[PDB]
Amino acid sequence: MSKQFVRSAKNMMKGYSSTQVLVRDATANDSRTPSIDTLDDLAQRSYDSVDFFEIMDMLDKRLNDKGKYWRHVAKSLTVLDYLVRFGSENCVLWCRENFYVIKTLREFRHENESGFDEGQIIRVKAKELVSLLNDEERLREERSMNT
Amino acid sequence: VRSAKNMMKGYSSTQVLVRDATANDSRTPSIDTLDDLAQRSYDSVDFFEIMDMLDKRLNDKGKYWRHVAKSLTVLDYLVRFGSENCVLWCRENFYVIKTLREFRHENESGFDEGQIIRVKAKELVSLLNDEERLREERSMNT
């Protein structure tokens, strides 16, 4: 019967493409960090305009979430930080137009049922990206060494 | 004559059955409904339609707690009496089952209605945690 990759097609029936699958699996729901090859692949695929839209529209709905789904925002800021300084130049221009989205994540606070503020990592992760996008002299170089 | 309750544009027999099994009401899922879901979970295309709906129903919050609760009882029946791939689907999505162990909610009356979602989510994790008894339970299902 079905094995390992057939059960992973549960998202394929849910209307997803290869680019939409791995960017969805990148911002997973466990304490695992996205594999760099997935972040590297997303950077290379961001050059294609068809993939770049599906990538950004996916992270758009992953960043506007709150509640117990704090791993939607924390991991999306991680891949978005990689796309900004490794992928297409439109990844920078896209964050400049949706700038007030990560600007509101500056105050993300979600406490789980144990007195632990899980949103603290989302605070420093969002404040760092804003400080990077507002430094064009720094941001331009960071995209140069990664070539 | 009473096909009128098929006001379901887009969904199929399997998708409507699982939605009617986890609907937001006081009606409890019956065994003849659960055994049909377990029977259809053996079929390939029917299996994904059951998991795709339980996925959208388990990931609910707010006052729609009855969608999450019934999806746990339905999933428990699919782990034991359903297909083997149902257990594989629960292993790859074992975190969605654990995130509901911290679920909390109470209606505007004062009673914590999330108390039942926790216990149902807890015993399901401990069920999959005991892989020895799992094959034992799936063996009796002859």
Author numbering:
A (entry chain A): 1 to 147
B (entry chain B): 6 to 147
Task: Quote the authors verbatim.
Clathrin-mediated endocytosis is essential for protein retrieval during neurotransmission and receptor recycling. Accumulation of the adapter proteins at the plasma membrane initiates the endocytic event and contributes to membrane bending. Complex formation has been observed between the ENTH domain of epsin and the ANTH domain of Sla2, the yeast homolog of human huntingtin interacting protein 1 related (Hip1R). Epsin and the phospholipid PIP2 are essential for clathrin-mediated endocytosis, and we show how assemblies are formed between the ENTH domain of epsin and the ANTH domain of Sla2 in fungi.
